[PDB]
Design a binder for this molecule. Structure first.
Ligand code: NA
Length: 121
């Protein structure tokens, strides 16, 4: 049907928007602490602590398979990256502090993206 194509045009434009959002958020991690999943070869107990690991590479695989139906889903994944980091790593570490910074800087970009999604549909 034609309706199915027009829903596919809107998912495709969302995905165009979220790719921009993602690259904007990844720029706020110039250290690349969050670019890849945490290694289970280097942190073998990681899954005893963190139940739903998340990272920018994993978000990008999903994004490009148009697996984010809306901004909420994409925000959930972003918060996992931050939120898991602040649990695994103690407050006085470069990792925890890097998360705090990404969260705060990320909040501006996400604040305007929720406006563009609402505005444009
Ligand atoms: Na902790």
């Amino acid at each position: 049907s034609m309706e199915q194509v027009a829903m596919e045009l809107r998912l495709t434009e969302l995905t165009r928007l979220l790719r921009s959002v993602l690259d904007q958020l990844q720029d706020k991690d110039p250290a690349r602490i969050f670019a890849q999943p945490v290694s289970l070869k280097e942190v073998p107990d990681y899954l005893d602590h963190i139940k739903h690991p998340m990272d920018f590479a994993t978000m990008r695989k999903r994004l490009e398979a148009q697996g984010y139906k809306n901004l909420h889903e994409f925000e959930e994944d972003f918060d996992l990256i931050i939120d898991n980091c602040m649990k695994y790593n103690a407050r006085d570490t470069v990792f925890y502090r890097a998360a705090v910074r990404l969260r705060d800087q990320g909040g501006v970009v996400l604040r305007q993206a929720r406006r563009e999604v609402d505005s444009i549909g």
